[PDB]
Design an enzyme around this catalytic site. Structure first.
Site, PDB file in Angstrom:
ATOM      1  N   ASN A   1      15.779  -2.838   5.298  1.00 52.30           N
ATOM      2  CA  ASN A   1      16.366  -3.557   4.250  1.00 52.30           C
ATOM      3  C   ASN A   1      15.604  -3.327   2.698  1.00 52.30           C
ATOM      4  O   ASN A   1      15.756  -3.869   1.934  1.00 52.30           O
ATOM      5  CB  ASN A   1      16.019  -5.145   4.311  1.00 52.30           C
ATOM      6  CG  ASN A   1      14.695  -5.565   4.235  1.00 52.30           C
ATOM      7  OD1 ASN A   1      13.583  -4.597   4.478  1.00 52.30           O
ATOM      8  ND2 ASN A   1      14.202  -6.722   4.500  1.00 52.30           N
TER       9      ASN A   1
ATOM     10  N   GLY B   1       5.661   2.905  12.854  1.00 48.21           N
ATOM     11  CA  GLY B   1       6.110   4.268  13.396  1.00 48.21           C
ATOM     12  C   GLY B   1       6.027   5.400  12.734  1.00 48.21           C
ATOM     13  O   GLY B   1       5.753   6.412  12.879  1.00 48.21           O
TER      14      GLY B   1
ATOM     15  N   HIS C   1      12.355  -3.169   2.160  1.00 49.76           N
ATOM     16  CA  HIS C   1      10.920  -3.591   1.646  1.00 49.76           C
ATOM     17  C   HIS C   1       9.864  -2.347   1.787  1.00 49.76           C
ATOM     18  O   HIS C   1      10.155  -1.174   2.497  1.00 49.76           O
ATOM     19  CB  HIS C   1      10.514  -4.463   2.729  1.00 49.76           C
ATOM     20  CG  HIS C   1      10.110  -4.115   4.211  1.00 49.76           C
ATOM     21  ND1 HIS C   1      10.630  -5.117   5.269  1.00 49.76           N
ATOM     22  CD2 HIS C   1       9.330  -3.070   4.870  1.00 49.76           C
ATOM     23  CE1 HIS C   1      10.061  -4.424   6.318  1.00 49.76           C
ATOM     24  NE2 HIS C   1       9.396  -3.580   6.172  1.00 49.76           N
TER      25      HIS C   1
ATOM     26  N   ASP D   1      -0.974  -3.707   4.276  1.00 49.44           N
ATOM     27  CA  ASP D   1      -0.736  -5.243   4.930  1.00 49.44           C
ATOM     28  C   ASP D   1      -1.274  -5.546   6.352  1.00 49.44           C
ATOM     29  O   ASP D   1      -2.036  -4.627   6.871  1.00 49.44           O
ATOM     30  CB  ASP D   1       0.933  -5.299   4.971  1.00 49.44           C
ATOM     31  CG  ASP D   1       1.635  -3.943   5.509  1.00 49.44           C
ATOM     32  OD1 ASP D   1       2.749  -3.985   5.032  1.00 49.44           O
ATOM     33  OD2 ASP D   1       1.065  -3.295   6.559  1.00 49.44           O
TER      34      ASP D   1
ATOM     35  N   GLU E   1       9.568  -8.280   0.641  1.00 49.25           N
ATOM     36  CA  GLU E   1      10.859  -8.371   1.192  1.00 49.25           C
ATOM     37  C   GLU E   1      12.038  -8.459   0.092  1.00 49.25           C
ATOM     38  O   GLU E   1      11.303  -8.739  -1.218  1.00 49.25           O
ATOM     39  CB  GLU E   1      11.058  -9.532   2.128  1.00 49.25           C
ATOM     40  CG  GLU E   1      10.249  -9.558   3.357  1.00 49.25           C
ATOM     41  CD  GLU E   1      10.818  -8.657   4.278  1.00 49.25           C
ATOM     42  OE1 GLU E   1      11.597  -7.626   4.226  1.00 49.25           O
ATOM     43  OE2 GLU E   1      10.470  -9.025   5.669  1.00 49.25           O
TER      44      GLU E   1
HETATM   45  O1  LIG Z   1       3.941  -1.765   4.944  1.00 49.84           O
HETATM   46  C1  LIG Z   1       4.551  -1.159   6.077  1.00 49.84           C
HETATM   47  C2  LIG Z   1       3.538  -0.352   6.642  1.00 49.84           C
HETATM   48  O2  LIG Z   1       2.052  -0.663   6.401  1.00 49.84           O
HETATM   49  C3  LIG Z   1       5.989  -1.341   6.243  1.00 49.84           C
HETATM   50  O3  LIG Z   1       6.762  -1.361   4.988  1.00 49.84           O
HETATM   51  C4  LIG Z   1       6.421  -0.401   7.019  1.00 49.84           C
HETATM   52  O4  LIG Z   1       6.202   0.885   6.393  1.00 49.84           O
HETATM   53  C5  LIG Z   1       8.288  -0.489   7.264  1.00 49.84           C
HETATM   54  O5  LIG Z   1       8.324  -1.783   7.700  1.00 49.84           O
HETATM   55  C6  LIG Z   1       8.761   0.587   8.186  1.00 49.84           C
HETATM   56  O6  LIG Z   1       8.055   0.625   9.417  1.00 49.84           O
HETATM   57  P1  LIG Z   1       8.544   1.661  10.487  1.00 49.84           P
HETATM   58  O7  LIG Z   1      10.042   1.890  10.528  1.00 49.84           O
HETATM   59  O8  LIG Z   1       7.619   2.805  10.139  1.00 49.84           O
HETATM   60  O9  LIG Z   1       7.504   1.228  11.992  1.00 49.84           O
END
Ligand SMILES: O=C(CO)[C@@H](O)[C@H](O)[C@H](O)COP(=O)(O)O
EC number: 3.5.99.6
Length: 242
Positions: free
Chosen positions: A136, A38, A138, A67, A143
């Site tokens: 968290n 998002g 990441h 990813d 993770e």
């Molecule tokens: O690798 C990715 C994006 O390619 C993830 O680290 C997201 O950046 C994270 O999970 C936040 O996701 P959103 O809060 O932006 O949906």
């Protein structure tokens, strides 16, 4: 690390698009590291706008994505291949064959990860790497507990990540359990990092990032070791800062 508080998501997105555009215009053959989720949605919308309002060209760019979910094909609406095509690639004048994303549907996911890392190296690493942050801490799907020396690899997603991303799936049972992600060292090799953070769900992560403890338990803390990191944080995400 340069931290910039933004008044709104729309301002964060404007500034992010401008920084990305700067990278593209300084080096038309730039390699951009890109992110899904998002958070960067507004950035992609504003980049596409600049394509119109400023005649910004993507003709010589190359991109690499962080990813992809394991087990999803490129035409699956929940794949990151589909996201990038829908939000970005279909709307710009790039060369499609120069957009790279890990193949989550490969027969041998370990081998796919090795080839992907090799590709990123062969491109000359990234000129800029866009990131978001997990609840968290990441980055990519690295993770908590991931080595800062990690390279592109297969990961088992934490339950918090599946919980967070469930909003995009038809059901909780369809949320994938595994993914392919650029590693922390893959990310740190970028020339420039642009970390985007928006909304109340990230306020605890922002606090931990800004408190500056460096450890594998909070992956984004690896960014304290990089020489050119910009972090854009909207008001809601900044609400618990130290
Ligand atoms: O690798 C990715 C994006 O390619 C993830 O680290 C997201 O950046 C994270 O999970 C936040 O996701 P959103 O809060 O932006 O949906």
């Amino acid at each position: 690390m340069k931290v910039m508080e933004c008044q709104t998501y729309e301002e964060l997105s404007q500034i992010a698009a401008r920084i990305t555009a700067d990278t593209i215009k300084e080096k038309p053959d730039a390699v951009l590291g890109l992110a899904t989720g998002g958070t960067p949605e507004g950035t992609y919308r504003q980049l596409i706008r600049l394509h119109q309002t400023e005649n910004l060209s993507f003709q010589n760019i190359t991109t690499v994505n962080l990813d992809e979910y394991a087990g999803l094909s490129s035409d699956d609406p929940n794949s990151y291949h589909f996201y990038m095509n829908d939000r970005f690639f279909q709307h710009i004048d790039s060369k499609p064959s120069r957009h790279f994303i890990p193949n989550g549907n490969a027969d041998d996911l370990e081998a796919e990860c090795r080839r992907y890392e090799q590709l990123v190296d062969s491109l000359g690493d990234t000129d800029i790497q866009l990131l978001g942050i997990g609840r968290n801490g990441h980055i990519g799907f690295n993770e908590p507990g991931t080595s800062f020396k990690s390279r592109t690899h297969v990961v088992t997603l934490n339950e918090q990540t599946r919980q967070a991303n469930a909003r995009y799936f038809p059901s909780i049972d369809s949320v994938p359990k595994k993914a392919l992600t650029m590693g922390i060292q893959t990310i740190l090799s970028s020339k420039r990092i642009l970390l985007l953070i928006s909304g109340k769900s990230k306020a605890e992560a922002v606090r931990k990032l800004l408190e500056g403890n460096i450890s594998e338990d909070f992956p984004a803390s690896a960014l304290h070791l990089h020489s050119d990191v910009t972090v854009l944080i909207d008001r809601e995400a900044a609400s618990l800062r130290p």
